[PDB]
Amino acid sequence: SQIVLPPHLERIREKLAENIHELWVMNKIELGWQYGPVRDDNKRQHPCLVEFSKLPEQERNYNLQMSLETLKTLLALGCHVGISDEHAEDKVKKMKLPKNYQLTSGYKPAPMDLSFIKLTPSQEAMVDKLAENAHNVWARDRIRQGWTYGIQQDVKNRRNPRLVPYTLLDDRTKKSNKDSLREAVRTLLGYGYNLEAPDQDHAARAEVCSGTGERFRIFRAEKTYAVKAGRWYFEFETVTAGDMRVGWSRPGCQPDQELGSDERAFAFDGFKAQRWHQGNEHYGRSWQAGDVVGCMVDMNEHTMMFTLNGEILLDDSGSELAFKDFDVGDGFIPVCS
Amino acid sequence: FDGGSRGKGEHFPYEQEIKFFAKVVLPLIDQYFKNHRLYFLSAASRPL
Amino acid sequence: LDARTVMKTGLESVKSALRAFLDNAAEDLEKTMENLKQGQFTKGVTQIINYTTVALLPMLSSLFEHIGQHQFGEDLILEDVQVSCYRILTSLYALGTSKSIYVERQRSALGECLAAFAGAFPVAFLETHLDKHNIYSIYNTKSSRERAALSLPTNVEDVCPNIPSLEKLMEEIVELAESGIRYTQMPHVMEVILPMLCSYMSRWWEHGPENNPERAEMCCTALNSEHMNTLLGNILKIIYNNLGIDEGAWMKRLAVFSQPIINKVKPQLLKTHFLPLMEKLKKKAATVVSEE
Numbered sequence: 001s002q003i004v005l006p007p008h009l010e011r012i013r014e015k016l017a018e019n020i021h022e023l024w025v026m027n028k029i030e031l032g033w034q035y036g037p038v039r040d041d042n043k044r045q046h047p048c049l050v051e052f053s054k055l056p057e058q059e060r061n062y063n064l065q066m067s068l069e070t071l072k073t074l075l076a077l078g079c080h081v082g083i084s085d086e087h088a089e090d091k092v093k094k095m096k097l098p099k100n101y102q103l104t105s106g107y108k109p110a111p112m113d114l115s116f117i118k119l120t121p122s123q124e125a126m127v128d129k130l131a132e133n134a135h136n137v138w139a140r141d142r143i144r145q146g147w148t149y150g151i152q153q154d155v156k157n158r159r160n161p162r163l164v165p166y167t168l169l170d171d172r173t174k175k176s177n178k179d180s181l182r183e184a185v186r187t188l189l190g191y192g193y194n195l196e197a198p199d200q201d202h203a204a205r206a207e208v209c210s211g212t213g214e215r216f217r218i219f220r221a222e223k224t225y226a227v228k229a230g231r232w233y234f235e236f237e238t239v240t241a242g243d244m245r246v247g248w249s250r251p252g253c254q255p256d257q258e259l260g261s262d263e264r265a266f267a268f269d270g271f272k273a274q275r276w277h278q279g280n281e282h283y284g285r286s287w288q289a290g291d292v293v294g295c296m297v298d299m300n301e302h303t304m305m306f307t308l309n310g311e312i313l314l315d316d317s318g319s320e321l322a323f324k325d326f327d328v329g330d331g332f333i334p335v336c337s
Numbered sequence: 338f339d340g341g342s343r344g345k346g347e348h349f350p351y352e353q354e355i356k357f358f359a360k361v362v363l364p365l366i367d368q369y370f371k372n373h374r375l376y377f378l379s380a381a382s383r384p385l
Numbered sequence: 386l387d388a389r390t391v392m393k394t395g396l397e398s399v400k401s402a403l404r405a406f407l408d409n410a411a412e413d414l415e416k417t418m419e420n421l422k423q424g425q426f427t428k429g430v431t432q433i434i435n436y437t438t439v440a441l442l443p444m445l446s447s448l449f450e451h452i453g454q455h456q457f458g459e460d461l462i463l464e465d466v467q468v469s470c471y472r473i474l475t476s477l478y479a480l481g482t483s484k485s486i487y488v489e490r491q492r493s494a495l496g497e498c499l500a501a502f503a504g505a506f507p508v509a510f511l512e513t514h515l516d517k518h519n520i521y522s523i524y525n526t527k528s529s530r531e532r533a534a535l536s537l538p539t540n541v542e543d544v545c546p547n548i549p550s551l552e553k554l555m556e557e558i559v560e561l562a563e564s565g566i567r568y569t570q571m572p573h574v575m576e577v578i579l580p581m582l583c584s585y586m587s588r589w590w591e592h593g594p595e596n597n598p599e600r601a602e603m604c605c606t607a608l609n610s611e612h613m614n615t616l617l618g619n620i621l622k623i624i625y626n627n628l629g630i631d632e633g634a635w636m637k638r639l640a641v642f643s644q645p646i647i648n649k650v651k652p653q654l655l656k657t658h659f660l661p662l663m664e665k666l667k668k669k670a671a672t673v674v675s676e677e
């Protein structure tokens with residue numbers, strides 16, 4: 001609502017709307033619909049075959065605002081507006097289609113072929129968001145009509161399986177409207193006004209948000225199983241690769257603090273390839289999905305070792321000791337975050 | 338300086354200009370770029 | 386340097402300047418080699434040679450090491466960049482093979498710059514049998530009309546006539562190994578050929594079918610792990626036959642350029658194959674020569 005149409009986009013826009021309704025009635029003829037008084041699939045006929053003036057003014061109106069709203073979405077997504085030269089637009093490219101493809105309309109069905117224009121990958125990336133926005137517009141319109149999602153379409157209860165997020169939208173209708181949007185934007189650029197794609201933002205959302213306030217869970221053995229002397233081994237299997245920490249913790253370890261942040265835990269974060277005890281250093285490499293981490297503690301000389309699929313993980317230097325020196329204290333138990 | 342080096346007069350009007358350049362501008366380039374080497378190589382491949 | 390972002394987004398004068406950089410470097414070492422080979426008898430030429438050794442060898446070596454180690458540069462090297470690179474390789478290799486007292490001073494700088502070139506250069510120039518398969522090839526990209534328009538030999542062999550073929554290079558290095566000749570007679574082989582062959586095979590390991598058996602005979606280049614075992618074996622035999630005298634840090638240079646090959650070969654292949662060098666370290670304990 002806040003944005004307005006610049007005069008250049010407007011006086012190219014009336015011709016854009018003409019071309020769009022033309023392409024609509026010709027896609028209507030390759031789908032094969034004919035001219036008739038009433039629209040019906042069995043009769044395979046449709047009154048909107050004639051040009052916009054003879055075409056029902058109601059449908060002419062709807063074509064026109066959906067075109068203008070689409071291009072306002074183009075402008076509102078941050079598309080770099082620009083023109084190569086007005087001569088390119090003044091030299092509109094106007095082939096003839098074959099006689100069989102010719103229709104009742106006196107003018108030609110396809111003045112311009114998609115062949116000589118090669119849309120930029122950034123342009124298809126843009127038209128992806130354009131399809132997202134068009135689908136969302138249709139969806140809110142149906143919600144305000146009163147429709148709601150249902151696996152089976154029912155006109156009585158206003159149920160539609162198509163009222164789903166576009167990521168889950170059906171592939172058939174998805175690609176149909178998607179190719180319609182292909183050709184719409186391709187004609188927009190090829191008619192003369194070469195809109196430049198917006199900046200391809202490489203910023204990663206990082207998925208910082210999580211369910212509830214809890215951000216990690218700490219799994220540990222019972223405090224009574226603490227070991228104060230001897231050599232011990234246990235394994236950690238990483239089903240999925242991500243932010244996990246495995247190691248040995250003292251029985252006083254807090255369940256709400258990260259492992260290794262305090263002095264009560266000795267952990268290895270392979271996601272960042274880091275050891276964790278009162279801070280983080282660089283230790284070992286990263287694990288992948290399915291990797292198994294074996295944790296060794298030698299409570300005789302107070303050393304700790306880690307493995308990744310068998311091979312010893314090593315420090316920044318050549319030392320294999322993750323933690324050379326620590327007090328026995330009250331013992332250690334296996335722990336993971 | 339190439340023009341004046343072919344000339345007989347080897348007096349350089351911009352001697353302190355090039356003194357500043359060579360002994361300040363050049364080393365700060367090296368230090369800055371070795372300190373932030375990763376900053377340039379990072380090319381939307383998400384390092385750091 | 387950041388070749389990706391420069392090539393996809395860059396202002397045209399910067400583009401032209403970055404091609405002109407290595408074009409000027411190319412003509413620099415071309416005139417340098419021409420005037421030094423013409424100068425069999427002894428100040429402008431001396432200034433050019435000094436500038437060459439001081440800067441051109443470090444500039445090209447550092448740039449090309451960066452390109453090779455970061456494995457990118459493919460879109461950086463396009464029309465006229467390839468031909469600049471072929472002129473540079475022809476000159477540097479032809480003079481690293483030719484023997485002169487002037488070269489014998491900075492042989493090693495050449496020995497490490499030529500190796501960096503081999504890693505950075507993206508088209509298989511040792512092999513021409515299946516070279517047409519390689520899409521990056523300026524021959525395939527540039528098309529017949531432009532290849533006729535450009536000052537191109539129109540034959541891949543004619544592009545680099547001085548350089549030898551890879552298969553005869555490794556059979557001759559095997560022959561030299563079994564002959565056991567000293568480093569003194571023909572040093573050039575063991576300071577340039579070995580580094581370039583190891584850097585070449587190291588870059589094109591994954592291009593070879595041994596990593597991707599698919600698209601068979603559509604492979605750009607053909608190479609095998611057994612060829613690598615032969616290479617490592619005859620390198621060890623070179624560092625074997627050549628222990629008595631002459632010592633040399635070129636031991637350490639060839640070891641560091643062969644570090645990739647011995648790292649990427651399997652440990653089971655390391656066993657029973659490289660234990661000779663560990664036991665020779667004891668066998669040459671009385672000797673002063675340094676190995677590995």
Ligand SMILES: Nc1ncnc2c1ncn2[C@@H]1O[C@H](COP(=O)(O)OP(=O)(O)OP(=O)(O)O)[C@@H](O)[C@H]1O
Binds near residue numbers: 058059160162
């Ligand atoms: N309000 C309307 N008045 C007249 N014709 C209409 C109207 N709405 C749609 N049409 C006609 O129907 C065609 C396509 O219908 P539309 O895209 O609105 O269907 P839909 O309800 O979204 O379909 P679906 O069953 O897949 O959910 C239009 O091109 C036009 O010819």
